[PDB]
Design a protein around this ligand. Sequence first.
Ligand SMILES: CC(C)CCC[C@@H](C)[C@H]1CC[C@H]2[C@@H]3CC=C4C[C@@H](O)CC[C@]4(C)[C@H]3CC[C@]12C
Ligand SMILES: CC(C)CCC[C@@H](C)[C@H]1CC[C@H]2[C@@H]3CC=C4C[C@@H](O)CC[C@]4(C)[C@H]3CC[C@]12C
Ligand SMILES: CC(C)CCC[C@@H](C)[C@H]1CC[C@H]2[C@@H]3CC=C4C[C@@H](O)CC[C@]4(C)[C@H]3CC[C@]12C
Ligand SMILES: CC(C)CCC[C@@H](C)[C@H]1CC[C@H]2[C@@H]3CC=C4C[C@@H](O)CC[C@]4(C)[C@H]3CC[C@]12C
Ligand SMILES: CC(C)CCC[C@@H](C)[C@H]1CC[C@H]2[C@@H]3CC=C4C[C@@H](O)CC[C@]4(C)[C@H]3CC[C@]12C
Ligand SMILES: CC(C)CCC[C@@H](C)[C@H]1CC[C@H]2[C@@H]3CC=C4C[C@@H](O)CC[C@]4(C)[C@H]3CC[C@]12C
Ligand SMILES: CC(C)CCC[C@@H](C)[C@H]1CC[C@H]2[C@@H]3CC=C4C[C@@H](O)CC[C@]4(C)[C@H]3CC[C@]12C
Ligand SMILES: CC(C)CCC[C@@H](C)[C@H]1CC[C@H]2[C@@H]3CC=C4C[C@@H](O)CC[C@]4(C)[C@H]3CC[C@]12C
Ligand SMILES: *[C@@H]1O[C@H](CO)[C@@H](O)[C@H](O)[C@H]1NC(C)=O
Ligand SMILES: *[C@@H]1O[C@H](CO)[C@@H](O)[C@H](O)[C@H]1NC(C)=O
Ligand SMILES: *[C@@H]1O[C@H](CO)[C@@H](O)[C@H](O)[C@H]1NC(C)=O
Ligand SMILES: *[C@@H]1O[C@H](CO)[C@@H](O)[C@H](O)[C@H]1NC(C)=O
Lengths: 344, 344, 344, 344
Amino acid sequence: AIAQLATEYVFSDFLLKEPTEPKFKGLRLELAVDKMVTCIAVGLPLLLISLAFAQEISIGTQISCFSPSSFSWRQAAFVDSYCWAAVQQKNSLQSESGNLPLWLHKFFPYILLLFAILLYLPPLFWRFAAAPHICSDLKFIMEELDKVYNRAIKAAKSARDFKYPIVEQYLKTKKNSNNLIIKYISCRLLTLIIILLACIYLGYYFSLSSLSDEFVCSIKSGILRNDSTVPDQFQCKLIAVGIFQLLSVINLVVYVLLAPVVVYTLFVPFRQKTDVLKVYEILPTFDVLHFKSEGYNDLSLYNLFLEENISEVKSYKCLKVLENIKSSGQGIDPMLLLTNLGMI
Amino acid sequence: AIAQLATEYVFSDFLLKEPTEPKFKGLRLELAVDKMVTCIAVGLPLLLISLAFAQEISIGTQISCFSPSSFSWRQAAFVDSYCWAAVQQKNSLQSESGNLPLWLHKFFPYILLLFAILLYLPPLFWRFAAAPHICSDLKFIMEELDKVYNRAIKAAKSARDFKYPIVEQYLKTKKNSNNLIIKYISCRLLTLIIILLACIYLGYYFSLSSLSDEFVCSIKSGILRNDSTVPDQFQCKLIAVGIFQLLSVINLVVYVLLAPVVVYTLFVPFRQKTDVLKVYEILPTFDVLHFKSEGYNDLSLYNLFLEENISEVKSYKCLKVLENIKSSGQGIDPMLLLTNLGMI
Amino acid sequence: AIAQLATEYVFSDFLLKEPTEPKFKGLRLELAVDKMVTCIAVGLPLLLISLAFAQEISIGTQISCFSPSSFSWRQAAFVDSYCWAAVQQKNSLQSESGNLPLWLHKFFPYILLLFAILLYLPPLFWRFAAAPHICSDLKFIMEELDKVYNRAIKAAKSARDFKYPIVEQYLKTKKNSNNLIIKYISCRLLTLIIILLACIYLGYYFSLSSLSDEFVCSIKSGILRNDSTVPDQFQCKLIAVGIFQLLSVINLVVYVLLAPVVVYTLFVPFRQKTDVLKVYEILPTFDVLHFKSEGYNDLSLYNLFLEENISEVKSYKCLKVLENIKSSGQGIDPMLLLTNLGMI
Amino acid sequence: AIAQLATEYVFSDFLLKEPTEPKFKGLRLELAVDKMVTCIAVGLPLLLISLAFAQEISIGTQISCFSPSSFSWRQAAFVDSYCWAAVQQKNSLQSESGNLPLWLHKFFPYILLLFAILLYLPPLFWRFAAAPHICSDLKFIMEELDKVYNRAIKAAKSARDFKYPIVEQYLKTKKNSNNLIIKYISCRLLTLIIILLACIYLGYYFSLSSLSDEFVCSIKSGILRNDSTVPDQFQCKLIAVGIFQLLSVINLVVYVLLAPVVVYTLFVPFRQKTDVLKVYEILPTFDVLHFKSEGYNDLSLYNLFLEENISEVKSYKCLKVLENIKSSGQGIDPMLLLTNLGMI
Ligand SMILES: CC(C)CCC[C@@H](C)[C@H]1CC[C@H]2[C@@H]3CC=C4C[C@@H](O)CC[C@]4(C)[C@H]3CC[C@]12C
Ligand SMILES: CC(C)CCC[C@@H](C)[C@H]1CC[C@H]2[C@@H]3CC=C4C[C@@H](O)CC[C@]4(C)[C@H]3CC[C@]12C
Ligand SMILES: CC(C)CCC[C@@H](C)[C@H]1CC[C@H]2[C@@H]3CC=C4C[C@@H](O)CC[C@]4(C)[C@H]3CC[C@]12C
Ligand SMILES: CC(C)CCC[C@@H](C)[C@H]1CC[C@H]2[C@@H]3CC=C4C[C@@H](O)CC[C@]4(C)[C@H]3CC[C@]12C
Ligand SMILES: CC(C)CCC[C@@H](C)[C@H]1CC[C@H]2[C@@H]3CC=C4C[C@@H](O)CC[C@]4(C)[C@H]3CC[C@]12C
Ligand SMILES: CC(C)CCC[C@@H](C)[C@H]1CC[C@H]2[C@@H]3CC=C4C[C@@H](O)CC[C@]4(C)[C@H]3CC[C@]12C
Ligand SMILES: CC(C)CCC[C@@H](C)[C@H]1CC[C@H]2[C@@H]3CC=C4C[C@@H](O)CC[C@]4(C)[C@H]3CC[C@]12C
Ligand SMILES: CC(C)CCC[C@@H](C)[C@H]1CC[C@H]2[C@@H]3CC=C4C[C@@H](O)CC[C@]4(C)[C@H]3CC[C@]12C
Ligand SMILES: *[C@@H]1O[C@H](CO)[C@@H](O)[C@H](O)[C@H]1NC(C)=O
Ligand SMILES: *[C@@H]1O[C@H](CO)[C@@H](O)[C@H](O)[C@H]1NC(C)=O
Ligand SMILES: *[C@@H]1O[C@H](CO)[C@@H](O)[C@H](O)[C@H]1NC(C)=O
Ligand SMILES: *[C@@H]1O[C@H](CO)[C@@H](O)[C@H](O)[C@H]1NC(C)=O
C-alpha cells in the first residue's frame, strides 16, 4: 500500500543503516549532507516507481487497445499484449510522437531504477574503497586525542597535588596527500552529473504532449497480414503515463533542489570551518597549532569528518564546555579542567 | 485489514521508536508534545490512505464508465482505463466542476502522502541536525548534576563523621546562543504552515459538490474520433470520492485541533516553568542561582528538555522527594539528604 | 482467518505488552482492571471488524444491485459501485429508512475503529503523561522500603550478636497533591463517556428494521438521466449488514457489562483497602503510622498501585509471611524476622 | 493449508508458552491437567474453524442459489449474496427446518470462536488474578526449603568434622484461607458449564436433518416484489454445512471426553496425595509434621502446585533419592545426606 511504501522509504532507516560490523562502532563514515543527498536521490525514484503502480492509483493493466466488439476476450488480450511488445517494433505501430515516447512510457520504471542504481554506485564505491582508511585514521586520531587529554589532566592533577605531537604530525602529513579528497570530489561530481542527466530525461518525459501514450497498433504481420476480419489497426493507450509524468516532474523538482546541495558539497574547503581542533589548543600537552584550512587536500575532508563525528568524544565535549565557559572568562581553563575530572 | 492498519499506526510504536543507537540511551531528544504532534500529523493521513482503499470499504475498481451493453468486457475496461488516464487530458473529458476536482479525486492518496512527508521532514531535520548537540550537552549536564550530588553527599557524610559551578556557567553561556531555539521555532513554524495548507486543501476538497466525481468521458481521439459504433461520450464516476471527502474532513478536524498545540509549542518561554534546577539549590556544593527564564534563547529549550527527561536522574529524584518533604518542614534538608544515602 | 484473528486479539498479548524500556522494569504502571477494560474496549471492536469481513463469513462484494439481464457484467459492476458511492448522494437513492442507515451500514468498520481509537486515547495519555512520574515515585518508594527492611534486619542481627521516616513523609506529602488522581479520574470518565456513546450508537444500529440495507438506486444523473435503455432504478442490498448488527449487539452487551467496571474504578477511595503498608508497621526502623485512607487524593491511587505491584518486593513478601504466621501467634515477629535472613 | 493449521495448533506451543517475564522463572503456575484441558478446549474449535474453510475442503462460495439460465453472472451473484444476508430476514426465506438452522449454519465459526473465548476466559482470569500470589508464595516456599536443606547439611558437616519452622507455620496459615481454592473451583466450574453448553449446542447442530442447509429464498422485496421476469423463489444451499456437522460432532466427542477430566479436577482434595513434604521430614532442621490433607482449603491447592513444580528443586530431588534408597534400608539417611554434598 501507499502508506507501507512511505514507511519503508521515508519513515524507516532506508540507506540510513550504520555499518553492520564492529570495525566502525559509532563512526558515520559519511557526512550528514552526503547521506541525505544519497538517500533522497536513491529512495525518491524507487518511491515513485512503487507509487505509480500502487493498487489504488492503478486502474489495472498498463495498456488497452479497444478491440472490436466481435473480438473475444482473449483476442483482445492478444491485441493488447502484442501492442505492448510491439512498442519496440517500429513497423507495427504508427504514432505521431514517434516510438521513443512509447519506449519511455513502457520502461519508465526501468529508467528510474537505473538512475537510482547509478546514484547509489558512487556512495557504494566510497564506502567500499575510501571508507575503511578514513575510519582507521579517524579512530586513531580520536584515541590519540583521548590519550593526550588524559595525560594533560593527569599532569595537572599531579601539579596540584615523549610529549611529542604525534597527532599533529599525522594531520600535517595528511595535508600533503589528496587521494581521499580526489575520490570524494570525483564521486560527488559523478553524482551531480547523474542527477543532471536524470533532470534532462525527466524534463523531456514531462514535456511530452500527453497524447503520445495513445498509439496506433497493427497486428498485421505473419498469417494475419492479409486477414480480412481483423481491422487494419487498433487504438491503444498506455495507462499510467500521466502518473509517470507527474512523478517525473516531482523527481525533477527534487533533483534540481538537490543539485545545489551537491555543488556546495563539492567545495569542501569552504565547508571546512569552525575549527574542531581549536578547542584542544588550551591543553599544555597539545601544541598550539591548528594548521588546517585553505587546501584542496585530504586535511579539509578529515576536518569535516572530525566536525561531524567528534561529538562522541568525551574529551572533546569537556574541552568544548570549557571553551564555552571561557566566553565569560570568569574562571581559568586549567582550573576548570582539573575540577571537571573527566578522564573517562 | 482495517484492524491491522489500526494496530500498525495507532496502537503500535509508529514513529515512537527511540533512537536505535548507544549514543542516546534513554534520552527522548524530542518533547512529548512535539512527538505527539508529529505522530498524529504523519500517521493520520497514512491511516486514512490505507482505510480509503481497505478491502472492505472498497467495492472494487476506482472508476466505472458504464459502457453500452454491446461493448465487450475488455472494451468497457479500455473505456474505464482511458478515462482514468484522461482525467489529466482536459480535451477528452467535459465535467461541470472542471478538471481540478478530477485531478484531486485521482491523486488524493498522493496528496495525503505528500503532506505526511512534508510534516515528517522538519522533525527529521531536527533529529539529524540539532538532536546530537543537545543530546551531548544534556548528557554532560546530567553527569555534572550526578557528580555534584555525589560530592555534596560525600561532604555531608564526612562532616557528620575546585568547587566551581561548571554546570551553572555552561547554562549561563547557553543563555546567549540561540541557534538551537531558532531551529526549533523554524521547524515548528514550518510544521504549522504545512498543517494550515493541508487544512486549506482538505476544506476545498470536502467543499466539492460531491457530483464532481461524475465526469463525461470521450474516447474519440485518433482512429476512433470518426468511428460511429462508439458513443460520443460515456458516464464515468470516480468511486471512493465520498470516502475521500469523509476522511479529508476527519483530517481537517484533527489538524485544526492540532494547530493550537503547535502554536502553544512555538511560545517556548511560556512553557519554560516549574524550574527543574530550583530543587538543586539546597545543595551546599551547588550555587544558589537558577537564572533560567524570560528569554528567546536556547536556555529555555534546554530547561524544557531537562524538565522532560530529568526523571531518569536518581539525584534529581532524591532532591525532588527532599523538596516535597520540605513542604511540611518537619525535618531538615541536609539531615534528610544524609539519611537518604542515594549516591548510586 | 477467524482463528488467526482470535489468536492475535484475545489469545495474544494484544495491548498487554509491558513498556519496552529499562526505565520501567517489572512495573505494570496500569492497574489490572484498567488494563482489562482498555484491552476489551479496544480489541473487541477491532475483532468484530475483522470477523465481519472474514473470508468465510463474507459471501463476496458488499453490495449487489441486480442489474437487468441485458446489462453486461461491467455495466452491472458500474451500477453496484455507483450505488456504493451514492449512499452519500441523497438524490441518487430513495430508501424508506432514510440515508443515515446507509451511511452507517457503509461506514460501520470506520465507526468501530473510531470508538477503539477514542477508547485507546485516554490510556495512551495516561501512559505518556502521568505514568513516568508514578513510576519514578513508586520505584523510589520500593527502594526505600527495601533499604529500611535491610537496616531493620541488620539492627536486629547486631542486637542478637538518621532513622528518619523519609518514605512516610513522602506519602504524607502525596496526601495533599491530587493532580495524578484528577488525571486518572478524568481519563476513566472520558472512557466511560465514550463507552456510553458507543452503546447508544450500537443500540441505534441494531434497532434498525434490518431492511434498511435494501435501498433503491438511480444511475440517472448526467448523460444517462434521459437515457431510455437504462431502468429508472435498481434494487440494491448492502450485504453483511446483518453481521454488522449481530456484532454491534455483541459489542453493546460487552460494553454495558464493562461500564459498571469503569464506574467502580472511578471510586478509587473505596478500592483503597487492605492496607499494604500495615505489614511494615512491625519493623522497629519504620514508624507505626499508615495514614492512607478516605481521600480523593493521589495517596489512594499510590496505595492502589502499591497493592498492585508490591508482590515483586522481597521485603514486602517476607513481612507478609511474618504477618500471616502472626495470625496463630505461636512465635515472635522480631525472632521470625531474624530467622528469615532475607536481606537480598 | 491443513498441515500448517495442524502445526500451529497441535504440534506447536499454542497456549503452552510459559509466562514471558522474569517474575515466574520456571514456574508453571498452571497444573498440567488444567493446561491440557484449556489447550484442547480452546485450540480444538479454532482448528475446526480453520479446517472447515481450508482451501482444499472448500469448493468455493458458502452458498449457491441456482439462478435461472437467463440470469447473468452478477444477477446470480446478487441472488446468492441476498439470500446469504437474508438468512436473518425471516420473511425473505421459507425453510422447513426454520430459520434458526440457517442462522447456525451461517454463524457456526462465530459460535465456535465464542466458545473458545469463553473457555479461555477463566484461565486468563486465573493467570491475571490468582497466579501472581501463588507464584510469590511458592517461590518463597522453595527458597525456604533450599535454605533449610543447606542449614541441615551444614549442621551435619559441622557435627561430622532461630531454628523456627517458618515454612511450616506459613503452610498452616494457608490451611485456613480458601480464596485461592475458591477461585480455582469457580473457574473450573465455569469451564465445565461452558463445555456442557457447547456440547448441547453441538449435539443440536449435528442432530439437524442435514437438509436444513437447503432453504427457499425470495428476492421479492422492494421494486422487485411485483417484477415478473424474476422467479418467485430460488433454491439455495449452504455449502460446508456437512463439514460443520462433522467437525461439531468431533468437538462434541472431545468435550464429552474432556468433561470427566474437569470434574476430576474440581475434586482437588482427592488429587492431593503423594505428600511432597513427607520427604523433608527426615531433616533435623525441619519439624516432623506434614499436616496437609483432607481440606477444601488453599493448602491442598498449594500441595498440588508443589507436587507439580517441585522437581526443579535440587534439595527436593536429593531428599527424594535419599527416600528411594531408604526403601532398601542398607544405609543411613544422615550419612547419605552428608555424602551427597548437594548444597548447590
Ligand atoms: C540519461 C541521458 C543519456 C538522457 C539524454 C537525453 C534524452 C532523455 C533525450 C532528450 C532529447 C532527446 C533527443 C531530442 C531529439 C532527437 C531528434 C530525433 O530525430 C532523434 C532523437 C533525438 C536525438 C532525441 C534522443 C533522446 C534525447 C537526447
Ligand atoms: C537540470 C535542469 C537544467 C533541467 C531542466 C529541464 C530542461 C533541460 C528541459 C525542460 C524542457 C525540455 C525540452 C522540451 C522539449 C524539447 C523539444 C525536443 O524536440 C528536443 C528536446 C527539448 C528541447 C527539451 C530539452 C530539455 C528541456 C529544455
Ligand atoms: C497545499 C496548498 C498549495 C493548497 C492551495 C489551495 C488549493 C487546494 C486550492 C484552494 C482554492 C483553489 C483555487 C480556487 C479558484 C481558482 C480559480 C480558477 O479559475 C482556477 C483555479 C483556482 C485558482 C484554484 C486553484 C487551487 C486552489 C488554490
Ligand atoms: C485552518 C482553517 C482556517 C481551515 C478552514 C477551511 C477553510 C479555509 C475552507 C472551508 C471552505 C473553503 C471554501 C469552499 C469553497 C470555495 C469556493 C471556491 O471557488 C474558492 C475556494 C473556496 C472559497 C474555499 C476556500 C477555503 C475554505 C474557506
Ligand atoms: C457517538 C455519538 C455521537 C452517537 C449519537 C447517537 C446517534 C448514533 C444517533 C442515535 C439517535 C439518532 C437521531 C434519531 C432521530 C433523528 C431525527 C431525524 O429527523 C434526523 C436525525 C436524528 C436527529 C438522529 C441523528 C443520529 C442519532 C443522534
Ligand atoms: C448504555 C445503555 C443505556 C444503552 C442501551 C441502548 C439504548 C440507549 C438504545 C436501544 C434502543 C434505542 C432506540 C431504538 C429506536 C429509536 C427510534 C429513533 O427514531 C430514535 C432513537 C431510538 C429512540 C433509539 C434510542 C437509543 C435506544 C433506546
Ligand atoms: C450455549 C447455549 C446457550 C445453547 C442453548 C441450546 C441451543 C443450542 C438450542 C438447543 C435446543 C433449542 C430449542 C429447541 C426448541 C425450541 C422451540 C422453538 O419453538 C423455538 C426455539 C427453541 C426454544 C430452541 C432454541 C435454541 C435451543 C435452546
Ligand atoms: C454433555 C452431553 C450430555 C451432551 C449430549 C448431547 C445431547 C444433549 C443432545 C443430542 C441430541 C439432542 C437433541 C436432538 C433433537 C432435539 C429435538 C428438538 O426439537 C429439541 C432439542 C432436541 C431434544 C436435542 C436436545 C439435545 C440433545 C439430546
Ligand atoms: C497474404 O496475401 C497477400 C495477397 O496479396 C500475399 O501477397 C501475401 O504473401 C500473403 N501473406 C501470407 C503471410 O501468406
Ligand atoms: C475521421 O473522419 C473525418 C471525416 O470528417 C476526417 O476529417 C478525419 O480526419 C478522420 N480522422 C482520422 C483519424 O482519420
Ligand atoms: C435529457 O433530455 C431531456 C429531455 O427533456 C432534457 O431536458 C435534458 O436536459 C437532457 N439531459 C442531458 C444531460 O442532456
Ligand atoms: C407492485 O405492484 C403491485 C400490484 O398489485 C402493487 O400493489 C405494489 O405496491 C407494487 N410495489 C411497488 C414496490 O411498487
